[PDB]
Design a protein around this ligand. Structure first.
Ligand code: PQR
Ligand code: ZN
Ligand code: ZN
Length: 184
């Protein structure tokens, strides 16, 4: 679980704020059991991108790559159907999106849903990767109030405090979902 200030700073969907250099990724798994999706709450977690190593030269490992690194250790049953949801503060850069597309193509027991607080630019070339991820079968969408509240409730050390939406949450979300539709 996550510090409240850490959630609030990072999942803020106002487009004019800066300094959100990190990407946070919260994940949940459901298994299909006879027409309903059943939550596997023992599999839930979150992670962030890694800082580059002190030696320089190589970039820090991206959260999306870390996430893919971890799935094999869940030891999912290849004969079963699973729905994996990521709640991401930024959407993936191009190279991560392509890696993700490749992953889901090779693992057809996994349905991927990425719900993103904000769209990451990746100097224009990120739009292409989001189209590639959608083509390989991933559902990509913008976090609304429902997703933000769920993530607060589920992944934050809230100590019983309810999710408090920031001013503009809904409008920013709606602006972003129009952008994403254009993109896809
Ligand atoms: C993914 C994740 C999620 O929570 C819902 O409700 C639906 C999806 N979909 C539709 N994936 O294809
Ligand atoms: Zn190193
Ligand atoms: Zn990346």
């Amino acid at each position: 679980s996550m510090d409240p200030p850490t959630f609030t700073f990072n999942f803020n969907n106002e487009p004019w704020v800066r300094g959100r250099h990190e990407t946070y990724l919260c994940y949940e798994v459901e298994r299909m059991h006879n027409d309903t999706w059943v939550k596997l709450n023992q599999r839930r977690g979150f992670l962030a991108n890694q800082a580059p190593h002190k030696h320089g030269f190589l970039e820090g490992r991206h959260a999306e790559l870390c996430f893919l690194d971890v799935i094999p250790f869940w030891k999912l049953d290849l004969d079963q159907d699973y729905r994996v949801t990521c709640f991401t503060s930024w959407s993936p850069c191009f190279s991560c999106a392509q890696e993700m597309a490749k992953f889901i193509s090779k693992n057809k027991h996994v349905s991927l849903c990425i719900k993103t607080a904000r769209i990451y630019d990746d100097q224009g070339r990120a739009q292409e990767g989001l189209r590639t991820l959608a083509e390989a079968g991933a559902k990509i969408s913008i976090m609304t109030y429902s997703e933000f509240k769920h993530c607060w409730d589920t992944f934050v050390d809230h100590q019983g405090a309810p999710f408090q939406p920031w001013d503009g949450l809904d409008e920013h979300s709606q602006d972003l979902s129009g952008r994403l539709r254009a993109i896809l």
